[PDB]
């Protein structure tokens, strides 16, 4: 941590310059020599300050670790409202989560943000005050004094005390056959229903270590980690983008139609070339794109759907179609509310599917199948909070969902949710 130390000392130097004792906002960016890679995650997990948020874009070129909440926001709308009051810092990012219910978020304007774009990094310090910048400069000084040296990530422990499913196997069929009853009757066709698996461990589970474990195995995935406090965290490694906005340029995608992966290149690629020719999944995928274009059309100019591709991940492969377009207004609250929850995580039609989930699910999804990422005026990117876990002390809660459709069948969809959960379960068991 000679890079960090040096950066911290440049920052303390800046904070010792005259700062005006008037309301305002300052952004201090210190260049971060990236002669080696920096284990931003290990650094974050060494700190006793909360909240912490860690995020890496799925391609591996963009990474951030942010610490300490100058201000918290309970929705993305309230976040964007704050940013619009400061248009002179167009690149000022707010970081965190949106819940499965998108009117609810946990987002922060961080004290400190280390951010790498591929080859370059910046340690950014911000000051903000309704009253005195000089005052908050004092806080920043104290917050720096608070930071400790990078310690080795702690270990994962593998001793299990219990294993609960919500719903269990019988409750799953109880619910599945209810859902097909309901499909039988009305105009609902697809409903995505979830399971929670609670893993109870004899020791408290270190969430950053779990995250570090996931990053090694779960390639080509967004990695996201929020430490709300010392006892509670939510994290995941999702292959799915909700949206990316650069100015008004928007990218989203219809990621639906699942097979299992196999480690041999040929058998996985036969399992995939199959997926691309299966009329049916291609139909299911196409109903997802239609729904996305529908949801988008009144707020965008031309929508371009790209050719299908198979996305090979660790335990599981997906059919995806990307959809690019331009937004009429550079607005993140529109992207959020138009795109979440996805047709891939609620089902179809939108209202009816959400209403079934609301009516009937035996546990709250909370942050599962919301989104994670950041927004600034200039750009934003959120992933869907899939392949994720909620960590509370000694309990780890894994989430995975399946799209019930008519012929479904309990046990097959259950097996599918096992495979989706696998990408995380295998790090712990």
UniProtKB/Swiss-Prot annotation:
Mutation effect (residue 344 to T): Lack of activity
Q: How is the cofactor bound?
A: Binds more tightly in the presence of chorismate.
* Location of the active site: 190 (proton acceptor), 240 (proton donor)
Please give one Pfam family short name: Chorismate_bind
Q: Which residues bind Mg(2+)?
A: 284, 416
Query: EC annotation?
Result: 5.4.4.2
Which catalysed reactions does the entry list for this protein?
chorismate = isochorismate
Q: How does activity depend on pH?
A: Optimum pH is between 7.5 and 8. The mutase activity decreases sharply at pH 6.5 and 9 to about 20% of that observed at the optimum pH.
User: Which coenzymes or cofactors are required?
Assistant: Mg(2+)
Domain of life of the native organism: Bacteria
Molecular function GO terms recorded: isochorismate synthase activity; magnesium ion binding
**InterPro entries tied to this protein:** ADC_synthase (IPR005801), Chorismate_C (IPR015890), IsoChor_synthase (IPR004561), MenF (IPR034681), MenF-like (IPR044250)
* Single Gene Ontology BP annotation: menaquinone biosynthetic process
Gene deleted: what happens?
Mutant produces only a trace of menaquinone.
Q: What are the record keywords, sorted?
A: Isomerase, Magnesium, Menaquinone biosynthesis, Metal-binding
As for family, the record states: Belongs to the isochorismate synthase family.
The free-text function statement in the UniProt record for this protein reads: Catalyzes the conversion of chorismate to isochorismate. Can also catalyze the reverse reaction, but with a lower efficiency.
Q: What is this protein called?
A: Isochorismate synthase MenF
Recite the lineage of the species: Bacteria, Pseudomonadati, Pseudomonadota, Gammaproteobacteria, Enterobacterales
> Which gene carries the instructions for this protein?
menF
